[PDB]
Design a protein around this ligand. Structure first.
Ligand code: ZN
Length: 347
C-alpha cells in the first residue's frame, strides 16, 4: 500500500519520516484530504544547500505536474502544493512550544476577522488530543478575507554604482537584520523559490548550484526608506573585516516586514556575473513573510540582470503577482549569460 500523508492530522514527525525515506530514485506519496487524493513523486533537491545558523535544511521536489514541494530541517517541515490554482502551505514545527508560538503568530491577522470562511484561509491542524501539530495557510484566500494593503516593487532596483564539468557553487549569504525575527519556514521557502526560478532557465543547474547560509548582522536600516537601507547595507559589508575575500558572493538583508511605500525588497540591478563579481555589488534586501512568495526570487532576478515585464503572470511584473517563474525570454537570456551560459550550449 502506497505511503500517504493525512492532511487532516499531518505533523512534523509525519513529514520527517516520509521525506527522510526519499532515496536517490524518488518515492511515491499520496496526499489525502476530504474528497482529495493526489499522488506525487517526490525527489531530493540536490542542487541547493541551505544552512540557517548552521542548521541544515533540505529541499524536495515533486514532478512538474504534481505542483508540490517540501522543506525539511531538524526543527520544522513544510509541504506546499497547489489546489484549484491556489497555493496551500502545511507548516509543522517539531517542538510543541515553538509550534504553539507559530500557530499564534499566523492566527494574529484574523483576530478581528470573523468570516465563517476563515478556516479555508487559516486552520490549526490537531493530532488524531488538542495539541496543534501543524497549520494550514492558503494565502490567496487569506488575502481575499483580510483585504489588506497590497505591497509592490515599483522602483525596486538601482543602477551600479563546452558546458563546465561541474556547476559553480554560488553562495547566497543572507543576513538577518539586527532586531528582526525570521521564522525558518518563511526564509527557507523564499530561498527555495529563488534558486528554483533560476534553475528553470536555460538548464542553468549545469552552471550554478546555490548555497544559502543565514546569520545575523549588526546592521539595521537607518530609516524606512528602501534605497537608503540598501546603500547602508552594502556599505556595512565593505566595512566588515569578517567578510574580506567574499566580495564575489551574493548578499541579501532579510527582514519580516517591508519598507516605506509598501516596498517589498530592493537590489542593485545587473550586479552579478560569474566572471566579474566583486566589491559586494551583488547585494539586495528582501522581506520574507509568507504572504509575499517569490520576493527574494524577484530581487535575485534583478541582481542577475532581469528587467520588469508587462506580463502579469511573470515573476518580474512590476507589481506583486505571487507567481514564481521567469516568462520573458529576454530576461532568461541575460540571467543565463551572467551565470556563464552561451546559446551554443543549448538548454
Ligand atoms: Zn522589481
Amino acid at each position: 500500500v502506497t505511503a500517504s500523508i493525512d492532511l487532516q492530522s499531518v505533523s512534523y514527525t509525519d513529514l520527517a519520516t516520509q521525506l527522510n525515506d526519499v532515496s536517490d530514485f524518488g518515492k511515491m506519496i499520496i496526499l489525502k484530504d476530504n474528497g482529495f487524493n493526489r499522488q506525487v513523486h517526490v525527489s531530493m533537491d540536490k542542487r541547493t544547500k541551505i544552512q540557517l545558523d548552521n542548521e541544515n535544511v533540505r529541499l524536495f521536489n515533486g514532478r512538474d505536474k504534481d505542483s508540490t514541494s517540501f522543506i525539511l530541517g531538524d526543527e520544522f517541515a513544510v509541504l506546499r502544493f497547489y489546489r484549484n490554482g491556489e497555493s496551500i502551505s502545511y507548516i509543522a514545527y517539531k517542538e510543541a512550544q515553538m509550534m504553539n508560538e507559530i500557530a499564534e503568530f499566523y492566527a494574529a491577522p484574523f483576530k478581528k476577522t470573523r468570516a465563517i470562511n476563515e478556516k479555508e484561509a487559516f486552520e490549526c491542524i490537531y493530532d488524531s488530543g488538542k495539541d496543534i501539530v501543524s497549520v494550514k495557510i492558503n494565502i490567496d484566500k487569506a488575502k481575499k478575507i483580510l483585504n489588506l494593503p497590497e505591497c509592490d516593487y515599483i522602483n525596486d532596483y538601482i543602477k551600479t554604482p563546452a558546458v563546465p564539468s561541474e556547476p559553480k557553487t554560488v553562495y547566497v549569504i543572507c543576513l538577518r537584520e539586527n532586531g528582526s525575527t525570521i521564522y525558518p519556514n518563511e526564509v527557507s521557502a523564499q530561498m527555495q523559490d529563488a534558486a528554483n526560478s533560476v534553475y528553470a532557465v536555460h538548464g542553468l543547474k549545469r552552471y550554478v548550484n546555490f548555497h544559502f547560509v543565514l546569520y545575523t548582522t549588526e546592521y539595521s536600516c537607518p530609516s524606512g526608506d528602501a534605497k537608503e537601507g540598501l546603500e547602508g547595507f552594502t556599505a556595512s559589508l565593505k566595512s566588515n573585516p569578517k567578510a574580506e575575500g567574499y566580495d564575489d558572493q551574493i548578499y541579501f538583508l532579510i527582514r519580516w516586514g517591508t519598507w516605506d511605500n509598501k516596498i517589498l525588497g530592493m537590489s542593485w540591478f545587473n550586479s552579478y556575473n560569474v566572471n566579474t563579481a566583486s566589491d559586494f555589488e551583488a547585494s539586495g534586501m528582501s522581506t520574507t513573510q509568507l504572504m509575499y512568495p517569490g520576493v527574494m526570487a524577484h530581487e535575485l532576478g534583478h541582481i542577475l540582470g532581469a528587467e520588469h515585464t508587462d506580463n502579469s503572470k511573470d515573476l518580474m511584473y512590476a507589481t506583486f503577482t505571487g507567481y514564481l517563474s521567469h516568462l520573458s525570454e529576454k530576461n532568461m537570456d541575460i540571467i543565463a549569460k551572467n551565470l556563464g551560459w552561451e546559446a551554443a550550449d543549448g538548454d
